[PDB]
């Protein structure tokens, strides 16, 4: 129940979103005893793919057009490659595991009626990445929460940046 005038709004939640079940897809490297690991990535037109969750009334096109008019235009931008990498050094006693996960911006577009949200379509367009380190002795049981994101989330704080879709 959100305090806005009846109508359609375009909305940016954060950079820094990450998706259910998708930790570990890219693989992960394991490094031991105070050597250093550096995993990183690029961006042709795989990383580049955005994920659309449309609704009746908010078709893919509608979404794309409408958020590219307000915010970061992505189709244009993710043609030029950009890189990112992380550099984790291990302690000397034990060894550690680090794996790469792609971060996304969460755009969504919302129908409001009666200070209430009746409908929401969502677009995740890929930003950069994020790595998670963990130190382990072999046999040491690990928290399932570490390897499995069970519900989408932002690893940064969210936000709610909005614009009314015009008539």
């Amino acid at each position: 129940t959100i305090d806005l005038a009846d109508g359609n709004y375009v909305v940016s939640r954060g950079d820094g979103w990450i998706l259910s079940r998708q930790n570990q897809i890219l693989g992960g490297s394991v490094i031991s005893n105070g050597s250093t690991g550096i995993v990183g990535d690029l961006r042709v037109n795989d990383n580049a793919i955005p994920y659309y969750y449309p609704t009746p009334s908010f078709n893919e096109e509608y979404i794309k057009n409408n958020i590219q008019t307000v915010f970061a235009n992505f189709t244009e931008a993710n043609q030029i490659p950009i890189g990112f990498e992380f550099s984790k050094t291990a302690p000397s006693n034990k060894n550690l595991y680090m794996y790469l996960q792609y971060t996304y911006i969460r755009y969504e577009i919302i129908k409001v009626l009666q200070h209430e949200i009746i409908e929401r379509a969502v677009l995740y367009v890929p930003s950069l990445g994020y790595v998670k380190s963990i130190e382990f002795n072999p046999g040491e049981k690990i928290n399932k929460d570490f390897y499995f994101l069970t519900n989408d989330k932002c690893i940064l704080n969210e936000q709610f940046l909005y614009k009314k879709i015009l008539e």
Binding site: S20, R21, G28, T36, T55, I118, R120, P138, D152
Partner: protein, 419 residues
């Protein structure tokens, strides 16, 4: 060790950092003179990478398929091409040389047909990962050489211990969907096109609560599954949205053919659920009734209520069913042989042979609104229970069993009646 799992397809992530024996996977060792530093880089000048795959059945569990199941389970994008890159770097101390060696690695996925107590099919998919590196003191080059025999082909895990399982929609079972969110009641007709095969029903609900779901005449027996991570992302009030999720989590339900059952489950508005109607067999038309239960029946929450119509006037009876896991529930609605005097009684001991449980006993009264459970006995300890109770002939009761210790895949319930 019991590993109850409501039979079907499961893909597991058995962990990262796997390598093959005999350095089939070593990139190479390089040796760092004290006070220098040295790295080994996988730059991805060329994308292509090789996964490794082995299966019990090519015909069923083909690499293409067992790849698709990883898409289903973890939405894995790429299988033999990574643009993601890795390097290992090390500095040697000034006293002694150091030497760093690097192995390519794999995440190890397992794909499983787990039908009815045992894995009837299994594939192992080794997905190319992002490295393992060992740093050691430089070995003395004069050190003597041990004639040493190579090892059996196989694998070593260097990543931390991991095993995380994910249920997946069986691509051979169709999906049918209910576009309208279920509200308070709803009756669903099994369409033509399912042709009495198994299939899935995707649906959602509007306001969150407890629902009784049965088929026509509580037959066939159903299972319900939550879809993992549903209902963040898109939503349209009143209807469902596809979300794009075929990774599923078993809530409750039997796999047994021709057992009579109804499900009683909690359902949350911000999630999507699949139901799995099994092979119909029958040529008559069937239906799935969803009712929202606001009454006493919430007591059976996240249980499948098993139906026993068939008691003999006296004697031993038993009812073997897939056991739920520790701290989940199986329930049992039974009506006791004999006409209802309201003074007549039959003596009823309720044992269980293999697993322990907390049994909860109710008398059932039914009104036009719904069941009413009157509370008869609590805290009953079932495992080989000496105990008995006098129940009323012709009256109808429900036993709700919480599994406490899980000692066997099936839970066998006895109703041994005396007079």
């Amino acid at each position: 060790r019991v590993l109850p799992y409501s039979n079907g397809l499961y893909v597991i992530n058995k962990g990262d950092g796997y390598i093959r024996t005999n350095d089939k996977d070593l990139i190479g060792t390089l040796l760092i003179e004290a006070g220098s530093s040295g790295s080994i880089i996988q730059p991805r000048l060329r994308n292509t990478t090789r996964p490794l795959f082995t299966t019990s059945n090519d015909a069923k569990f083909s690499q293409q398929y067992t790849e698709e199941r990883l898409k289903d389970a973890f939405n894995v994008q790429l299988f033999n091409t990574s643009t993601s890159l890795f390097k290992f770097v090390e500095e040697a101390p000034s006293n002694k040389n150091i030497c760093i060696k690097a192995y390519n690695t794999y995440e190890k996925y397992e794909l499983i047909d787990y039908q009815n107590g045992s894995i009837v099919n299994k594939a192992e998919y080794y997905l190319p990962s992002l490295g393992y590196c060992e740093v050691t003191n430089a070995p003395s080059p004069e050190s003597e050489v041990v004639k040493t025999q190579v090892a059996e082909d196989g694998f070593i895990q260097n990543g931390p211990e991991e095993e995380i399982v994910v249920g997946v929609i069986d691509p051979s079972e169709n999906i049918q969907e209910i576009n309208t969110a279920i509200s308070d009641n709803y009756t669903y007709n099994i369409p033509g096109i399912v042709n009495n095969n198994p299939f899935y029903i995707l649906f959602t609900v509007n306001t969150t609560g407890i629902y009784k779901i049965n088929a026509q005449n509580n037959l066939p027996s159903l299972k319900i599954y939550e879809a993992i991570g549903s209902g963040n992302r898109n939503f349209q009030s009143g209807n469902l949205c596809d979300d794009d999720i075929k990774a599923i989590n078993y809530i409750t339900g039997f796999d047994s053919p021709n057992a009579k059952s109804y499900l009683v489950v909690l359902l949350n508005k911000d999630k999507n659920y699949y139901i799995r109607v099994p092979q119909t067999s029958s040529n008559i038309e069937n239906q799935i009734k969803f009712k929202r239960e606001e009454g006493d029946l919430r007591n059976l929450m996240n249980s499948s209520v098993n139906i026993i119509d068939n008691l003999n006037s006296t004697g031993a009876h038993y009812y073997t069913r897939q056991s739920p896991d520790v701290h989940d529930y199986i329930s049992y609605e039974f009506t006791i042989p004999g006409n209802f005097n309201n003074k007549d009684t039959s003596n009823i001991r309720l044992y269980t042979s293999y697993n322990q449980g907390i049994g909860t006993l109710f008398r059932v009264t039914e009104t036009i609104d719904g069941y009413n459970l009157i509370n008869i006995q609590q805290n009953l300890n079932l495992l080989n229970s000496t105990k008995s109770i006098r129940l009323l002939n012709g009256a109808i009761y429900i036993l709700k069993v919480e599994v406490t210790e899980l000692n066997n895949y099936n839970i066998k319930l006895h109703i041994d009646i005396t007079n």
